[PDB]
Ligand binder design. Structure first.
Ligand SMILES: Nc1ncnc2c1ncn2[C@@H]1O[C@H](COP(=O)(O)OP(=O)(O)OP(=O)(O)O)[C@@H](O)[C@H]1O
Ligand SMILES: Nc1ncnc2c1ncn2[C@@H]1O[C@H](COP(=O)(O)OP(=O)(O)OP(=O)(O)O)[C@@H](O)[C@H]1O
Ligand SMILES: [Mg+2]
Ligand SMILES: [Mg+2]
Lengths: 540, 557
């Protein structure tokens, strides 16, 4: 409730300018009707050289000033809320990237995008509708309460009588409103995930002929959202009707107590319109303050994501100028955080040397990619330790470590940029000579020239405009452009043909690289210096 | 502008009822002081009854309007998504996932919000102004007011196109940012593997800068438009005030009968001001809904579905001079002159180098694309002659890199089938594909939910689940596209026994695409494909004694 003002702190001059223009606007529209009355009551004989012209000229200049200030206030409010929404989006997206890898499996991508798109606009769009109405209502209530001169005990009776404006009903309505807004946002995210999954995997959906199923699922989600919206609207309308009905209970009592006192008849009917206006205005003020609080509180998910601490250790500070590249697994046992109490590794212990090639073999589900992910400091072991040059691998700097320990994954993931933007991914600076050398080393330069624009050809989303072997070669080139010290290859030749497989088979022609290959088929790991066979997470 | 009003044409009865309620309420609001309920008792209870009846009518009108607008929003959001999935395949190459999702989920919501905000206000102030025009007919000043009123509408008509030209750009920028976000969030293990979180943050900030640039122009235009409409209303008041003051002195209308025109004028000018303020929001709404209406009006370039559902179908597939060009990059041929036949009860293997065009053949056989210069026939009839669901039930495939969805294991195997299969059939398919070994070991079994894109499964397990999903259909035409690239030596025996030892092989025609040449030795036919052309064809032996490309590939070490 107070984080929003601290976030909107860099928008203070726009807000104070908007308040200045707003008080100028309300002063102008307060002072206009008196001179409008002076204009109209001149009907008892028209004065041509004076009186009429001066009054209409003064009304002209008053309306001109009020209009200019109103336009300035509206523009300032619109710009301020656009800036606040963009700041919230930037901060939430920057906070989401720091989280642990187990956070992204308990959540869904379309739901996160729905939060970033809708929940940020929910906590910004209310102020241009709310602040002007609330301030105008406050000014009008203060002005209408300045009619104390009419009759003395009326205001004292009014304050005590209208002080309990159904506090319990207000709290009940605020609780129900906040709950239904939270449910609405959850349903919207659930509906967006359906579109997320249907559009992203369209080729499989078309291949099985199941687009109508996705349309039906989306329509079910839309029906749930529509039901929640109608519940919210009906509750709001019922609350407004109850308030408008109960407003009469004080008005008839004051209009009866004036007759009961028999302050005169000509003065008793001189403030009924004032009483109705001040009651409606204070009811509007209380309602819009409650709506403000409920709408701010309904977006607590975005605040929870922006203040979430990742389940990662303290960041490293080590960055040696020379790295030997000897890797040690010592008594390492691991179980995944999203699915605990089912161990994947059961006491692994081995050493990887700079001058040798190590092969890791086993059946499906044995845990080889788990070993690779623990080697890249993507997960923390529940027992034992992973050491790089006799130091824990979590003590090294984040940017330093991932330029030295580089891996090719089981399923390579490309991005929407060009070829050279994927080869040089994650690198601050990279000359074109290094990129072409890495493409030559990965045997990728043969098909690069065949594409239009060469290395500037727009690779499709997820590398969908290439073959699988071409994507594999691009991933190998991306790994090799960094000149790594420890190189992991998690089935890096699963898509290449026979000739490209026998062409890329040394991996240690440099002689100072710690290579770990992970393979299923044989006749590619005879030249491995060390062979490790693991079954159900135990080394044999 | 007509499309926006036509998109709400399914609720005509409810809008007519709301219009009748609005007209009745406005005529009650403008006929209260003439009668005020004379006699018929005391008057304060009549005031209470009037307030109660004013509350109830507002409650009913609000309920009807809100229910109607919710129905309109849900219906429009459904139709946009229904129109998106009807397009061709390459439409999803030009348009990214985040852009399409921002169009479907966010542009429609903005259009519905603007429509629901503006329509009731327009109707209320239009009825109010139309009644106030009627009761104000000094007769002679009314035509003066009506001829000076079009002039105030000259300025917005020259301006409102600007309101579109910003808004479209704004929507585009938002879509771009969304795509960036999703491309960072679906590949988090890769990004953290290269320490590139700052790059994704900078990529987000690049689009946020463009949105920030457009917002300033939006705010300036809003302030200037508010100024202009206020000066127009002030001028409308002052002109009639000056002409009334001049007409009072020079006979004509007396000042007694002229004063009553002016109170009506102060309210008619305010109604005109509100109607002037509504129009730029309508132009902005036209700007916000250009892409979704383009999606709705777009016609797909793929041929429509047929109506053929034969009871008995065989796996006889014929290629006749089939060539393809991949219309994303035309004027380069991926396939040149393919001509081969698939017979039921037989296996045909498609071997070749990388990038030769084997997955293009597999995608052409799934009716994902149409051939450029040949005929692809299934039982002597083209693929578009068959019904969509029937054709994609009869022909089934696995895929080079298989994809699974975020649901339980039992409805991932049975994804897309109209008639739900029994648990025994799912168990039989998982036994056949080799997926029964690990699913039975899971704590929840076949009800185990997998996440988005199957992160809880390894590569071989995902391949086995995809094979079971292909096998559940009993497909006569079977396509395997590197189906054993992640399977171990134990799981390849299942595929070998499926290909050459199952009892059901006589009811299938198999197209097998592999880089593992051990499975190709028992294939009935082998086709070598290089550069999109079939260089060699025949059995394993006939290709071995003739030397050539296949013998060069086999005798590699
Ligand atoms: N993200 C995850 N969350 C939970 N469990 C997982 C996750 N990834 C893998 N597992 C499970 O961990 C076990 C080992 O999987 P892993 O990917 O490490 O095996 P692998 O030997 O590399 O497999 P393959 O040879 O099939 O590629 C399996 O039982 C798998 O279901
Ligand atoms: N969506 C696409 N748009 C444009 N060109 C594409 C697209 N998909 C593939 N290509 C191109 O078409 C050619 C054939 O690719 P294809 O996927 O058919 O090869 P492949 O024989 O299956 O390869 P591999 O053995 O590596 O899997 C390649 O040059 C590739 O770059
Ligand atoms: Mg693996
Ligand atoms: Mg392929």
């Amino acid at each position: 409730m107070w984080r929003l003002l601290k976030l909107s702190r860099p928008d203070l001059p726009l807000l104070v300018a908007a308040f200045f223009f707003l008080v100028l606007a309300v002063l102008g529209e307060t002072l206009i009707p008196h001179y409008s009355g002076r204009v109209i009551d001149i009907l008892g004989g028209d004065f041509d050289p004076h009186a009429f012209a001066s009054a209409i000229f003064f009304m002209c200049l008053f309306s001109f000033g009020s209009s200019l200030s109103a336009g300035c206030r509206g523009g300032c409010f619109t710009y301020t809320m656009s800036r606040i929404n963009l700041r919230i989006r930037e901060q939430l997206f920057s906070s989401l990237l720091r989280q642990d890898l187990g956070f992204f499996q308990e959540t869904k991508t379309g739901e996160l995008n729905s939060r970033l798109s809708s929940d940020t606009t929910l906590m910004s769009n209310w102020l241009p509708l709310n602040a002007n109405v609330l301030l105008r209502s406050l000014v009008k209530v203060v002005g209408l309460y300045g009619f104390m001169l009419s009759i003395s005990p009326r205001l004292t009776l009014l304050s005590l009588l209208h002080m309990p404006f159904t506090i319990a009903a207000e709290k009940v309505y605020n609780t129900r409103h906040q709950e239904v807004l939270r449910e609405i946002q959850d349903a919207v995210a659930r509906a967006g995930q359906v579109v997320r999954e249907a559009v992203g995997g369209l080729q499989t959906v078309r291949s099985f002929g199941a687009e109508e199923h996705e349309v039906c699922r989306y329509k079910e989600a839309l029906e749930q959202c529509r039901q929640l919206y109608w519940r919210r609207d009906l509750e709001r309308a019922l609350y407004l009707l109850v308030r408008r009905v109960l407003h009469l209970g004080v008005q008839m009592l004051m209009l009866s107590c004036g007759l009961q006192q028999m302050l005169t008849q000509g003065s008793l009917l001189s403030f009924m319109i004032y009483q109705e206006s001040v009651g409606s205005y204070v009811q509007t003020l209380v309602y819009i303050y409650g709506d403000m609080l409920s709408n701010v509180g309904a977006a607590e998910k975005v605040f929870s994501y922006m203040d979430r601490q990742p389940n990662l250790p303290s960041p490293g500070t080590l960055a040696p100028t020379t790295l030997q590249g000897v890797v040690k697994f010592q008594d390492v046992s691991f179980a995944y955080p999203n699915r605990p109490d089912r161990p994947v590794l059961k006491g692994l212990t081995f050493t990887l040397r700079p001058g040798e090639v190590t092969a890791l073999v086993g059946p499906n589900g044995s845990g080889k990619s788990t070993v690779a992910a623990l080697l890249q400091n993507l997960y923390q072991p529940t027992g034992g330790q992973v050491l790089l040059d006799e130091k824990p691998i979590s003590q090294y700097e984040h940017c330093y470590l991932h330029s030295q320990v580089v891996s090719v994954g089981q399923e390579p993931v490309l991005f929407s940029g060009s070829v050279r933007n994927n080869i040089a991914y994650g690198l601050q600076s990279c000359e074109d000579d290094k990129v072409m050398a890495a493409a030559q080393a990965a045997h990728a330069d043969d098909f690069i020239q065949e594409m239009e624009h060469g290395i500037y050809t727009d690779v499709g989303e997820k590398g969908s405009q290439l073959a699988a072997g071409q994507k594999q070669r691009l991933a190998i080139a991306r790994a090799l452009v960094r000149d790594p010290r420890v190189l992991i290859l998690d089935q890096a030749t699963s898509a290449l043909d026979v000739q490209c497989e026998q062409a890329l088979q040394d991996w240690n022609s440099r002689g100072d690289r710690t290579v770990l290959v992970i393979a299923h088929r044989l006749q590619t790991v005879q030249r491995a210096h060390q062979i490790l066979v693991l079954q159900e997470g135990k080394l044999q | 502008v007509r499309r926006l009003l036509g998109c709400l044409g399914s609720e005509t009865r409810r809008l007519s009822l709301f219009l009748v309620l609005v007209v009745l309420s406005s005529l009650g609001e403008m006929a209260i002081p003439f009668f005020t309920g004379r006699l018929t008792d005391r008057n304060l209870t009549l005031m209470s009854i009037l307030t109660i009846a004013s509350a109830v009518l507002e409650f009913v009108g609000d309920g009807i309007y809100n229910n109607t607008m919710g129905h309109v929003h849900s219906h429009l959001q459904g139709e946009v998504f229904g129109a998106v999935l009807r397009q061709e395949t390459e439409f999803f190459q030009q348009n990214q996932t985040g852009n399409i999702m921002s169009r479907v989920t966010e542009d429609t919501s903005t259009l519905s919000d603007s429509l629901s905000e503006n329509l009731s206000l327009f109707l209320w102030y239009l009825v109010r102004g139309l009644c106030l025009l009627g009761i104000m007919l000094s007769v002679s000043l009314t035509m003066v007011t009506l001829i000076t009123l079009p002039l105030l509408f000259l300025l917005p008509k020259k301006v409102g196109k600007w309101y579109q030209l910003l808004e479209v750009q704004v929507r585009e920028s938002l879509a771009k940012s969304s795509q960036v976000a999703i491309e960072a969030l679906s590949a988090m293990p890769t990004v953290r593997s290269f320490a590139n979180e700052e790059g994704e943050a900078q990529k987000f900030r690049e689009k946020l800068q463009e949105i920030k640039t457009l917002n300033q122009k939006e705010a300036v235009a809003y302030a200037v438009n508010s100024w202009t409409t206020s000066i127009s209303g002030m001028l409308l008041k002052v002109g009639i005030l000056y002409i009334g003051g001049q007409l009072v002195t020079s006979g004509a209308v007396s000042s007694g009968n002229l004063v009553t025109f002016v109170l009506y004028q102060m309210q008619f000018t305010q109604a005109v001001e509100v109607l002037l303020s509504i129009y730029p929001r309508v132009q902005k709404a036209v700007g916000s809904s250009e892409k979704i209406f383009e999606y709705l009006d777009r016609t797909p370039r793929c041929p429509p579905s047929g109506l053929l559902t034969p009871l008995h179908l065989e796996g006889l597939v014929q290629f006749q001079d089939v060539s393809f060009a991949y219309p994303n990059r035309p004027d380069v041929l991926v396939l040149q002159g393919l001509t081969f036949t698939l017979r039921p009860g037989e296996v045909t293997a498609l071997v070749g180098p990388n990038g030769s065009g084997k997955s293009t053949v597999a995608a052409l056989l799934q009716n994902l694309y149409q051939p450029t210069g040949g005929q692809l026939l299934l039982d002597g009839k083209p693929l578009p002659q068959y019904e969509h669901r029937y054709l994609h039930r009869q022909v089934a495939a696995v895929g080079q890199e298989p994809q699974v969805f975020g649901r339980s294991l039992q409805e991932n195997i049975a994804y897309g089938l109209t008639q739900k299969p029994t648990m025994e059939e799912i168990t039989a398919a998982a036994v056949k594909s080799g997926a029964h070994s690990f699913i039975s070991g899971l704590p929840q079994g076949y009800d185990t939910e997998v996440d988005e894109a199957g992160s809880q499964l390894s590569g071989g397990q995902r391949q086995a689940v995809a094979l079971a999903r292909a096998l559940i259909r009993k497909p006569c035409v079977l396509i395997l596209d590197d189906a054993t690239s992640a399977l171990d030596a134990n799981s390849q025996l299942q595929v070998e026994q499926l290909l050459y030892e199952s009892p059901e092989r006589y009811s299938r025609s198999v197209l097998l695409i592999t880089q593992h040449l051990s499975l190709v030795e028992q294939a009935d036919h082998i086709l070598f494909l290089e550069g999109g052309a079939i260089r060699e064809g025949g059995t394993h032996q006939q290709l071995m004694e003739k030397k050539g490309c296949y013998w060069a590939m086999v005798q590699a070490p």
